[PDB]
Amino acid sequence: LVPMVIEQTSRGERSFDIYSRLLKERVIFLTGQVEDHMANLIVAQMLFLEAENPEKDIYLYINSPGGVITAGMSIYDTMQFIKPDVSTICMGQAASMGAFLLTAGAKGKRFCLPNSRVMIHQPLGGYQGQATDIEIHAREILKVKGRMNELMALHTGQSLEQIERDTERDRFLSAPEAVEYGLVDSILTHRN
Amino acid sequence: LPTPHEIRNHLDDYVIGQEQAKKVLAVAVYNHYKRLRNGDTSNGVELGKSNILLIGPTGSGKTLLAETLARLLDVPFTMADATTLTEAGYVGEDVENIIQKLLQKCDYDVQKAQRGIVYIDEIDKISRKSDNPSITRDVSGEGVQQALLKLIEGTVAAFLQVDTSKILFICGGAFAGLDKVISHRVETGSGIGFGATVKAKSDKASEGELLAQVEPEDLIKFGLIPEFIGRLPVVATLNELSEEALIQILKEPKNALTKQYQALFNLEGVDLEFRDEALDAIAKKAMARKTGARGLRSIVEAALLDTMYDLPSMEDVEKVVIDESVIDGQSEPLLIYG
Amino acid sequence: PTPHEIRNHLDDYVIGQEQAKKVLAVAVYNHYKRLRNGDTSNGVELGKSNILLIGPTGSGKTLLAETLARLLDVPFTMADATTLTEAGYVGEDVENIIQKLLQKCDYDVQKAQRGIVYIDEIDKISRKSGEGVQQALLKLIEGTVAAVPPQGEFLQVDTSKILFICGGAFAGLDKVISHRVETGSGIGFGATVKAKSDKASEGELLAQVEPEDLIKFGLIPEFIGRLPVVATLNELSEEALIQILKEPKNALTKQYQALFNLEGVDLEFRDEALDAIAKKAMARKTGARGLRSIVEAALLDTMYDLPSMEDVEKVVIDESVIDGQSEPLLIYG
Amino acid sequence: ADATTLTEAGYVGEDVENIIQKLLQKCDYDVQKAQRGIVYIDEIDKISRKSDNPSITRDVSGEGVQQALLKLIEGTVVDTSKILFICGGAFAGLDKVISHRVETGSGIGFGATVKAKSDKASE
Ligand SMILES: Nc1ncnc2c1ncn2[C@@H]1O[C@H](COP(=O)(O)OP(=O)(O)OP(O)(O)=S)[C@@H](O)[C@H]1O
Ligand SMILES: Nc1ncnc2c1ncn2[C@@H]1O[C@H](COP(=O)(O)OP(=O)(O)OP(O)(O)=S)[C@@H](O)[C@H]1O
Numbered sequence: 001l002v003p004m005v006i007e008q009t010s011r012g013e014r015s016f017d018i019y020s021r022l023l024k025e026r027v028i029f030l031t032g033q034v035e036d037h038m039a040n041l042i043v044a045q046m047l048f049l050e051a052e053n054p055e056k057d058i059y060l061y062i063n064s065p066g067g068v069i070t071a072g073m074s075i076y077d078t079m080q081f082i083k084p085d086v087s088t089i090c091m092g093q094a095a096s097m098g099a100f101l102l103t104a105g106a107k108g109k110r111f112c113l114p115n116s117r118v119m120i121h122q123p124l125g126g127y128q129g130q131a132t133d134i135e136i137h138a139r140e141i142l143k144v145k146g147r148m149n150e151l152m153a154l155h156t157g158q159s160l161e162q163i164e165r166d167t168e169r170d171r172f173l174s175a176p177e178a179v180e181y182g183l184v185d186s187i188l189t190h191r192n
Numbered sequence: 193l194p195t196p197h198e199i200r201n202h203l204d205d206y207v208i209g210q211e212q213a214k215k216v217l218a219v220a221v222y223n224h225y226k227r228l229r230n231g232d233t234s235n236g237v238e239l240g241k242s243n244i245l246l247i248g249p250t251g252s253g254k255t256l257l258a259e260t261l262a263r264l265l266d267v268p269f270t271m272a273d274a275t276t277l278t279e280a281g282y283v284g285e286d287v288e289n290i291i292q293k294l295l296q297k298c299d300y301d302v303q304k305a306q307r308g309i310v311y312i313d314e315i316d317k318i319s320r321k322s323d324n325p326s327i328t329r330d331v332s333g334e335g336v337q338q339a340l341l342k343l344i345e346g347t348v349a350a351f352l353q354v355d356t357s358k359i360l361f362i363c364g365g366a367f368a369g370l371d372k373v374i375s376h377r378v379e380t381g382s383g384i385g386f387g388a389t390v391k392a393k394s395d396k397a398s399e400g401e402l403l404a405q406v407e408p409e410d411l412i413k414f415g416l417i418p419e420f421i422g423r424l425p426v427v428a429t430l431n432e433l434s435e436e437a438l439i440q441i442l443k444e445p446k447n448a449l450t451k452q453y454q455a456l457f458n459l460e461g462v463d464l465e466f467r468d469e470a471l472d473a474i475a476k477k478a479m480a481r482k483t484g485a486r487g488l489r490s491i492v493e494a495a496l497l498d499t500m501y502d503l504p505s506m507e508d509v510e511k512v513v514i515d516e517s518v519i520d521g522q523s524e525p526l527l528i529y530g
Numbered sequence: 531p532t533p534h535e536i537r538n539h540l541d542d543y544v545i546g547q548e549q550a551k552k553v554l555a556v557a558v559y560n561h562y563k564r565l566r567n568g569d570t571s572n573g574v575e576l577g578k579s580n581i582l583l584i585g586p587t588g589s590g591k592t593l594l595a596e597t598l599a600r601l602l603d604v605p606f607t608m609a610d611a612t613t614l615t616e617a618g619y620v621g622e623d624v625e626n627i628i629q630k631l632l633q634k635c636d637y638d639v640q641k642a643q644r645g646i647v648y649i650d651e652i653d654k655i656s657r658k659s660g661e662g663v664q665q666a667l668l669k670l671i672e673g674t675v676a677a678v679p680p681q682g683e684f685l686q687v688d689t690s691k692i693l694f695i696c697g698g699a700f701a702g703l704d705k706v707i708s709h710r711v712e713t714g715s716g717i718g719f720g721a722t723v724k725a726k727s728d729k730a731s732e733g734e735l736l737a738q739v740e741p742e743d744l745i746k747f748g749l750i751p752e753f754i755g756r757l758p759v760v761a762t763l764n765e766l767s768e769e770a771l772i773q774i775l776k777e778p779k780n781a782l783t784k785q786y787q788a789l790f791n792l793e794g795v796d797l798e799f800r801d802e803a804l805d806a807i808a809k810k811a812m813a814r815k816t817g818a819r820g821l822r823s824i825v826e827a828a829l830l831d832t833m834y835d836l837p838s839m840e841d842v843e844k845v846v847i848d849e850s851v852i853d854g855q856s857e858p859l860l861i862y863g
Numbered sequence: 864a865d866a867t868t869l870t871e872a873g874y875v876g877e878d879v880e881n882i883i884q885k886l887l888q889k890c891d892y893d894v895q896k897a898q899r900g901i902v903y904i905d906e907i908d909k910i911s912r913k914s915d916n917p918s919i920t921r922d923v924s925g926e927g928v929q930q931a932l933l934k935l936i937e938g939t940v941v942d943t944s945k946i947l948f949i950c951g952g953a954f955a956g957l958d959k960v961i962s963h964r965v966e967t968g969s970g971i972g973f974g975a976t977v978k979a980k981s982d983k984a985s986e
């Protein structure tokens with residue numbers, strides 16, 4: 001069930017849900033495993049907010065263990081294409097594609113909760129078939145791994161070699177460690 | 193009798209930053225004088241009456257244009273505010289007295305008064321309004337507009353009967369709120385996809401461009417009766433003074449407020465000078481206020497408020513120097529003792 | 531004047547709308563011929579025949595009523611229904627406008643009976659208040675002694691002898707008409723999609739209009755009954771606007787040229803330039819209304835400098851001048 | 864005097880100035896004796912502005928009446944700067960506003976404040 005909130009305005013009472021009410025304030029949610037259906041929905045929300053106001057910041061809370069890499073790339077392109085700066089805040093956890101999107105936000109606007117956790121790992125795939133087909137798929141996944149590493153180094157500011165070594169295996173970093181690594185900028189502990 | 197170039201040259205001596213406004217007004221007024229010179233109008237086609245409408249943002253100088261053109265012309269020129277105009281048979285000032293005001297200014301010269309010009313200011317104030325919460329009888333409103341339309345169209349009414357068909361009529365008044373209807377019609381929707389044109393709210397067409405494109409339906413929706421709009425084929429639209437125009441009006445004019453304060457301090461034997469880097473800073477601040485030329489006086493008054501509060505009390509004062517920092521509030525005005 | 535004479539004179543000031551001119555001319559001739567018979571020897575009473583005008587915005591519906599009225603010495607007034615005209619909180623009753631018509635006729639009620647009061651934007655009050663205006667306007671359209679008491683003693687004139695012409699730029703009326711007589715779907719492969727920039731058949735479709743169509747549009751049955759005479763106006767095509775520049779007696783080109791002839795300088799507009807102005811006017815969607823503004827602005831630059839310049843015999847405007855590539859060529863002499 | 868009969872200046876009906884006029888009738892039209900007099904007003908709560916509906920139209924019978932009273936109540940200009948004024952009226956509904964403030968307790972959950980009508984504060 002989704003609670004229905006009411007917003008008081010001069011025109012009159014308006015009916016909205018919990019998610020819709022926050023969307024009107026330029027807020028987006030990224031919950032559940034990343035896929036084509038959910039990823040497309042997020043992209044649509046970003047486009048709508050840009051048309052309403054191409055200057056106000058668009059928030060996006062990332063809370064998911066990850067999902068399809070291809071689906072996640074669409075969200076990254078939209079964030080870097082729309083003029084409004086996308087502010088990403090990590091809530092709960094952000095692993096696999098979630099971690100990549102966390103560091104993809106506008107510089108100086110990335111935040112995370114004090115107890116949030118971010119995990120980064122190399123791309124996961126796999127193909128079965130003839131030898132020739134397996135070779136093509138192996139090259140494709142390798143190329144995606146290199147591109148992802150370069151993008152990560154661009155935001156976090158670390159060297160390309162450092163990112164590759166740290167992505168060889170799953171790496172768990174707490175909120176304080178994320179700031180030093182470069183994934184996020186500051187930590188939102190209490191409202192001031 | 194004066195060519196459009198002559199009126200423009202002498203008109204800019206007082207008004208600044210309105211070259212387009214003076215060009216349209218000069219052409220329309222010049223054409224009317226040509227018809228008056230030779231009223232036979234042998235041509236089959238009868239040119240419509242050339243009535244110029246002065247519409248623009250507050251403080252642009254619409255009333256200033258009316259006064260400046262009066263000096264150049266020798267025909268009688270009387271100014272009447274529509275606020276006092278009311279329906280006949282009431283304590284309010286009758287609208288039929290406007291024509292009389294033109295005769296008195298001409299020394300009762302009815303023969304020479306038929307070629308006069310009358311200007312009306314604050315026309316938007318008499319826009320028809322719903323008489324629901326109004327007083328028992330809406331003396332002021334659509335009644336004044338309809339009565340004026342009688343003379344604009346051309347009728348003989350009284351003294352000696354005077355024909356208003358050939359009497360040039362010029363309208364004025366700053367239409368407050370008309371920019372909302374104009375912007376609503378011209379503005380179009382914006383797409384949401386990647387291949388869509390998205391315009392930021394800050395990067396919105398200035399009010400000057402919106403007024404440059406107007407349609408009769410906008411005036412009718414504002415309150416003006418539809419017949420009144422048709423009678424004014426010429427619509428001279430003004431534009432808000434730009435930053436470059438504000439600085440010019442701040443120094444070039446003989447009665448510039450800058451020199452007004454300088455003479456004010458001369459009473460006690462003190463004088464002040466405004467640095468060039470400070471004149472432009474004052475102009476930009478005035479533009480933010482959106483009050484036109486009137487905002488320049490307020491800005492300088494506040495900046496010099498402290499100077500006038502303690503200068504007379506102090507002794508051994510010779511000169512005062514004000515720069516951009518002083519007006520911006522960063523530091524206090526400089527003063528050299530002597 | 532007989533209907534034929536009325537048609538000959540009106541076609542000079544306004545061009546096109548052949549069908550609307552035939553129905554409009556007969557309607558005015560039948561109404562006025564009845565009023566002239568004030569004696570009414572025959573016991574049969576003469577009833578008014580209200581006229582209805584339907585056409586796209588900018589087609590000249592208002593110009594047809596005003597121009598036709600000028601042919602006669604009777605007064606003509608106009609009103610707008612967008613303000614919800616009514617004697618109450620709904621708006622401002624048009625009764626005041628009726629008194630204005632009386633004023634034009636030296637404030638004589640006898641002559642005011644021949645009024646041609648016209649109400650524009652009538653389609654804007656269609657029922658979806660909207661229906662309230664129509665209901666209150668039913669009696670006014672027909673005979674009704676009640677009206678604003680004039681102040682010249684208080685009289686009460688009837689609105690039965692004054693002709694009433696209601697006309698508005700109905701939006702979407704062509705869709706309902708097509709769905710009634712014309713066949714075919716509007717969506718699908720087999721649907722007959724009408725090009726927005728081509729195949730301007732809206733005017734022809736409007737001719738096949740019946741009272742049933744107006745009922746669905748929103749107009750109440752009582753209002754439609756009040757208007758027995760119905761007329762239609764076809765949209766002005768790109769070529770039609772070109773003719774309006776020269777064919778009309780008081781055309782824009784003739785007015786500006788005559789003005790320049792006063793100083794001895796004659797300006798001539800070539801056929802190439804006329805079509806250039808018409809094509810851009812259609813894009814602006816302003817119709818014939820914007821033709822005077824665009825043409826004046828094009829020649830405004832040279833008009834201002836014309837009186838000051840010396841040694842001028844006759845100027846000319848080329849097609850490139852309209853586009854701004856060059857300026858009007860001047861022949862020294 | 865009656866506050867309901869009063870109305871904003873510039874409209875038909877008795878205005879604020881009429882209040883002093885009635886006082887003159889009681890003081891045989893004597894300026895000296897009028898300055899030392901006292902006035903009373905009844906049904907003052909009837910001219911209260913309708914705060915529920917935002918002010919969009921001139922409330923001649925409401926807000927306008929109070930605005931005009933702001934001058935003569937404390938003294939303005941006949942001068943009314945030396946006559947005591949007493950206002951009285953059976954304010955209806957004022958108890959609801961007071962309760963909504965002092966009580967400041969409501970809700971559905973366990974932490975809410977729910978009490979029977981008997982325990983609720985009386986008017
Ligand atoms: N274009 C201008 N050039 C020079 N001085 C100007 C100009 N416009 C305004 N001023 C100055 O501003 C003073 C007052 O401005 P106004 O002409 O009264 O503005 P306004 O448009 O009449 O305001 P309204 O009538 O309330 S909308 C004039 O006396 C001038 O000193
Ligand atoms: N057939 C025509 N011949 C000549 N001029 C025309 C013709 N049709 C329109 N015009 C011109 O275009 C102007 C606008 O056309 P109209 O239909 O009269 O405007 P309108 O009827 O007031 O529009 P609405 O219904 O109020 S939105 C007229 O005032 C004429 O100057």
Ligand SMILES: [Mg+2]
Nearest residue numbers: 591592650651
């Ligand atoms: Mg019209």
